Structure 1
């Protein structure tokens, strides 16, 4: 199965920068969401979930076809809560109806990371909507109650190695878990992208507790949390080495996250040799906007 990127007709960098700006301006405007966390974290989570259905073995799933717009996928129990990100992107889709759905969902994640002071994430256009029957079945996204070997095996399906897995998981410094969405509750409620996930893993005093949905999670005295899959990154000695690296080098972490997140968003896509190069959007702050 081949999905060839096809640039939205006649569009170039400046068209997509306008879309980025509209997302970024709405991020700034709709500040109250989730007790003033704002929409950044849920848009990162949405970009990852729409990409994380990919299966390298047959090229099913993935961001290309924009299939999250179909009920089977937006109703996946693994996607509970992401409807808030979809609703946030709806007026953007209405203003720019030419951008494909996969391009919009993935650009939402890029814009959120950058506007939250994260790394620049190069982004390529050309995902093309595919029909409802191309929507992947539920059950391709990962469980949180599992250990390091589960995480490692899970991410082989996405063609990610240990460093890429540990880098991507640093997004769990953003936002929070919500009991009604996932059966987990807690988190830093942060909307600034940093390497704090790794520092918190190494430096907090963690206790394994049950939450009010009767699931186990790691809680710290200072009010942070880790899922069992997060904490597994310090139980496995190979992951632990990388956690220590990122806790000790914010620039390294930013560079490695940027590469892994672009790769995640592009898995499954064949780009023509004469496709445009990846775009690097300016933030609102770099534009004086």
Structure 2
């Protein structure tokens, strides 16, 4: 099963920069969302969830087909809360109706990372909407209650190694958990992309507590929170070494995150040899906008 990237007809970098800018300007405007976190974190999560259905064994799922637009996927319990991100992107899609759904959802993630002062994430266009029957069944996204071995095995299906997994999980500095979405609560209100996930894991005093949904999570008195799967990164000796590395090297974390996140967003896609090079979008700030 082969998904060949096909550039939206006649479109070029400048077209996609316009879409980036519209997302970025709406991120700035709609600042009240989720007690003033804004939509950055939820858009990052959306990009990851639409990508994280991929299965390397058969090339099912993945970002290419834009299948999150179909009810089976939209309604996955694992996706509860992402409807907020989809509704954010609706007016962007109306303005730019030519962009494919997978391109839009993945570009939303890139835009959010960059506008939150994260690394540049190169991004390629050409995902093509596929029909409803290509939607992957629910259950491909990861559970949060499990341990390091679960996380390691889980990510092999997405062709991610230990460094890639630990880098990707640094996104858990962003936003928060919401009890009514996932059965986990808390984390604060951060909307700046930094390496603080790693620092927090290493330097906070963590307690294993039960939340109001009767699930265990790790809490600190400063207000940070780690899921069991987050905390597993300091329980496993191989993950812990990498956590330490990123805690101690912001640039290294940014570079490794960028490469893993692009990879995630591109898994499953065949780029023809004469496809455009990846685009690196300017932030609003770099444009003086």
Normalising by structure 2, we get a TM-score of 1.00
Output the aligned Cα RMSD: 0.2
Structure 2 counterpart SS, 1:98: coil
1:237-256: CA deviation from partner (whole Å, max 9, x where unpaired): 00000000000000000000
Aligned equivalents of 2:190, 2:263: Cα separation in 1:
24
Cα distance per residue 1:97-156 (max 9 Å; x no partner): 000000000000000000000000000000000000000000000000000000000000
Cα distance in 2 for partners of 1:73, 1:270 equals: 23
Contact residue 166 and residue 243 of structure 1 kept, 8 A? yes
Contact 1:53-1:141 within 8 A present in 2 as well = yes
TM-superposed CA distance for 1:189, in Å, is: 1.2
Q: What are the equivalent positions in structure 2 for 1:148-167 lying under 5 Å apart?
A: 148-167=148-167
Q: Helix, strand or coil: the match of 2:120? A: coil
User: CA offsets per residue over residues 179-238 of structure 1, 9 Å max, x none?
Assistant: 000000010310000000000000000000000000000000111000000000000000
Q: Give me the whole-angstrom Cα distance separating, in 1, the residues matched to 2:222 and 2:41.
A: 21
Cα distance in 1 for partners of 2:189, 2:229 equals 19
Q: Is the 8 A contact 1:198 1:243 kept in 2?
A: yes
| Partners of 1:220 and 1:240 in 2: CA distance | 19
Query: Would you say the 8 A contact 1:173–1:188 is kept in 2?
Result: no
The 3-state SS of whatever aligns with 2:209 is strand
Mapping for residues 23-42 of structure 1, pairs under 5 Å: 23-42=23-42
Partner Cα distance (2:26, 2:143) in 1: 31
Task: Name the SS for the 2:125 alignment partner.
Answer: coil
Gaps spanning 5+ residues in structure 1: where?
none
Instruction: Check the 8 A contact 1:184/1:211 in 2, yes or no.
Output: yes
| Per-residue Cα deviation, 1:39-86 (whole angstroms, up to 9, x for no partner) | 000000000000000000000000000000000000000000000000
Paired positions, count = 289
Distance 1:189 1:266 in 2: 29
Alpha-carbon distance in 1 for matches of 2:162, 2:282: 30
C-alpha separation between the residues in 1 aligned to 2:201 and 2:220? 10
CA distance in 1, matches of 2:188, 2:144: 18
TM-score normalised per structure 1: 1.00
CA contact (8 A) 1:52 1:264 kept: yes
**CA–CA separation in structure 2 for the residues paired with 1:245 and 1:186:** 26
Structure 1 residue ranges, 4+ long, deviating more than 3 angstroms after superposition? none
Question: Unaligned regions of 5+ residues in structure 2, if any?
Answer: none
Deviation by residue 1:5-60 (Cα, 9 ceiling, x = unmatched): 00000000000000000000000000000000000000000000000000000000
3-state secondary structure, aligned to 1:91: helix
User: 1:165-176 residue pairs with structure 2 within 5 A?
Assistant: 165-176=165-176
